[PDB]
UniProtKB/Swiss-Prot annotation:
Domain notes: Is exclusively composed of 4 tightly packed alpha helices (no beta strand is present).
Residues of the full protein shown: 18 to 67 of 68
GO cellular component assignments: extracellular region
Protein name (database record): U1-agatoxin-Ta1a
Keywords for the protein's UniProt record, in alphabetical order: Amidation, Disulfide bond, Secreted, Signal, Toxin
Annotated source species: Eratigena agrestis
Length: 51
């Protein structure tokens, strides 16, 4: 049970905006999209299925 602040510091400001932008598109799984810092099947699937 640790914070995901490291994930935000690891990426750039623009990155957080891009990832988050797509996250809101995946659907109602936003929480899950950021759950693993954009590192999950939920996002990997949506993002790949996002034109």
């Amino acid at each position: 049970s640790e914070p995901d602040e490291i994930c935000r510091a690891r990426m750039t400001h623009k990155e957080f905006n891009y990832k988050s932008n797509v996250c809101n598109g995946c659907g109602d799984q936003v929480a899950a999209c950021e759950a693993e810092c954009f590192r999950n099947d939920v996002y990997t699937a949506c993002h790949e299925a996002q034109k």
